Write a structure and sequence with these properties.
Chain lengths: 267, 257, 259, 267
């Protein structure tokens, strides 16, 4: 197994289509022992995580809660055994209030909303690292999820800005984590299609992206030299696990693209 | 002159060594008609602006105050005349609480501090653009100030994160401004200069690298090259540049050593 | 009413027709008060007739940028034009050539090395050659500007010319090092694209090039060379005095947007 | 093994200090079956490759020789078995005549020298791909070696230009290789110290880098959040094998940095 004997904390599992779910699934298939986090309705998280290959303990973590963050290392140690430390941490937490996205005018997003999206999506990558580094092994690896924000694009709007900030945070976290031998990297994934139910009785599932976002996302498979399957999270999950492994041991503060090569081409 | 007849709003004048002061000075030397803004130390700013080549009116603007922002377009029109519009706007406001700029470890900066610095240094570029675009002419130019955040650096810490955010914001402001024919760009400037302390010492050592790297050298005591570059972007001579970042750093960022 | 380049002496390469971007660079420069020296090699008689359509007279020197004798004599021949006590303030490299095998008339892999090397020579290496030849007669504070087409991403048809432009960007950063020793700046302008027997490569390029106006926040007019010409003149001026080794985009903002 | 059952062609083994030697070593340790190339003193290359963990056939390949390139596929099929194809190809070929490097003035490099370095160091990445793609499996991987040329630097001079060209070539090779399901990527390695002998009777080993290049290379360990060991090729060799594996399956046209994180930091 690529991650045999490694102990890995995975944040961000909300549904069975959360990219963190597939990261967790591949890591377990590759021999890792997981610790999972959730915040709201832990019982509902427990139901999803019971669909993973192997059991895994669930810890409560609201990344905006300094008390949760302050106690996390000790709660991790309780569950993995006090002599043991983590080898990997996955940050898969991204959120921006809807006023900051979609067809809401970019200029109309209230600061309070954008600040919260910045907190959850970018600042919390630093918060999580600070919280977990005291219980990580030398040579360990922290990986966060990115969506390339180098160029502006329709709909992604202020979430793009939060990802630009996240990329910058990642470089400082790598500086801090490196002092104790830990790597920090982001995976810039191509778009993965997400379904959500209409919030009404009789509701059905349907694509979350609106028209403009869908048109934007369909460009990836057109551009990607090896194509891009928006319904397939597995290549992204494998890439995260590559960074959690010891096979990129000299990469840190960096961004690895799992996007079919789309960002390298222009049509 | 380079900006002959252009009406330009300049934010960020604090002292007569502020880069905004030198931007305003060069712009007036090049024929611009200015409107200035201030908030903190507003009487002091009026005194400072008397040292400019020419007088200019001053409007109060706290870029965190949505009432100040919503009234700004009407207040500008009152100053310049209701049938006239601005051709240029300069965003030269950067603030990050010291806890985000190296007086403590990176990890110790509290969110409330970093959020405020993000608000002032990144979000408000969008706020100001939203406020001014209704009174800007087609072909106009919004320019903000940047400090290259592509790589992490000693001490600059969360201000560098804010500037990465600002660069992203600029690309979206360009999208919105272009709908009415207005450009939006940043200038990535090189650094401009007993109780001294660690964060200041770290920044000093980092900043001395620019002159070492810059093929044409870098004078940390000379704001004029940066001010001239801003005026270039305010002029009609970069009419197809938007969403972009122009480096005024001696070429330091293009060289490894 | 001072012009942007008032009193400056500027050498301009690359004028082939009155549609050449170099023609428009020269035209705007003269409108802004510059005194020009022009160069040509192929179709010299044609170039002379073309250069007479510029606003003001300008002498024409022969320069094959692959000819080391032409390069080596260039500084002395410039001094004859402008006076031994005078120097140039600006130099424009607007020479790009890649044999058609490197620009999409056949698949990328089929381009022969000899063709690609020739295009590398003319489109990338000669930026360094020209700088070497002109710098001894350039003033401190002067400016060398070359023409770029953003090669950060692979594109249809442009193929090995894109590779040459990647190389050119790297050359520019090294020319900046050498030029900086005598106070001279070196930069590239990355321009957006400027416009029955139509053929495949041209069709691919047209479809690709129409995307600039779609992406550009301020639009992009492929029929209008003036914004690019002005941007070159901005770099030749004293208004970007701390920019060197760099790439300035004159593309409507298209490269900053995905859609 | 990370590369169990994979057939991989490795170019560029000159000495037992060539990065390609260490790539070949790790690939064999990870279960790969190799085919090796050489051009100069094939008997001397056979002697170097006998120190690899396992035997591997050696094929002659001058990448400037179109007859060598045109026959390469058939000569590969002969040695790996007529029904078989390659899963991986490593390009580790870089050369610039000395007039193009060091304390030679940048402006004094003759074009014929720079053209030759461009041919060997950049054009030949396309030539090798063209020659080997007919005998590569879908899902295969081509990996070339890079030294980050994003900024100019002392000494590296025209080789920097060649690497800039190589990066561009890699993005076009990715477009072409992707049509048959093959990825193409570069590894941008930190500097690896190289010793060479003075060309004199009684000669000794010493660093090939001149003063300015040594000062440049020494910055990596200072900048790198996890440090950078110029004497250790292994992290770079491992990163190449990561790209040859199936664990970065959606990465193509790209550049993976194995440099300790140094390019993400500024002092």
């Amino acid at each position: 197994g690529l991650l045999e004997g490694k102990r890995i904390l995975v944040t961000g599992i909300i549904t069975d289509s959360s990219i963190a779910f597939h990261i967790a699934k591949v890591a377990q298939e590759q021999g890792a022992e997981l610790v999972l986090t959730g915040f709201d309705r832990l019982r509902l998280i427990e139901r999803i995580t019971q669909r993973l290959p192997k059991p895994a303990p669930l810890l409560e973590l609201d990344v905006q809660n300094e008390e949760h963050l302050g106690s996390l290392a000790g709660r991790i140690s309780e569950v993995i055994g006090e002599g043991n430390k983590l080898d990997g941490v996955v940050h898969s937490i991204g959120f921006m209030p809807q006023s900051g996205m979609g067809v809401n005018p970019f200029f109309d997003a209230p600061f309070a909303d954008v600040s919260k999206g910045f907190h959850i999506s970018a600042f919390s990558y630093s918060s999580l690292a600070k919280a977990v580094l005291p219980v990580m092994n030398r040579g360990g690896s922290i990986v966060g999820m990115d969506f390339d924000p180098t160029r502006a694009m329709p709909a992604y709007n202020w979430m793009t800005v939060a990802k630009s900030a996240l990329e910058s945070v990642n470089r400082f976290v790598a500086r801090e984590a490196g002092k104790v031998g830990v790597r920090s990297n982001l995976v810039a994934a191509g778009p993965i299609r997400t379904l959500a139910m209409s919030a009404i009785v009789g509701g059905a599932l349907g694509d979350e992206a609106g028209q403009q976002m869908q048109l934007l996302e369909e460009g990836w498979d057109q551009r990607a030299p090896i194509g891009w399957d928006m319904k397939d999270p597995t290549p992204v999950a494998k890439t995260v696990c590559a960074l959690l492994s010891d096979w990129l041991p000299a990469t840190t503060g960096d961004i690895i693209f799992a996007d079919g090569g789309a960002h390298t081409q222009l049509l």
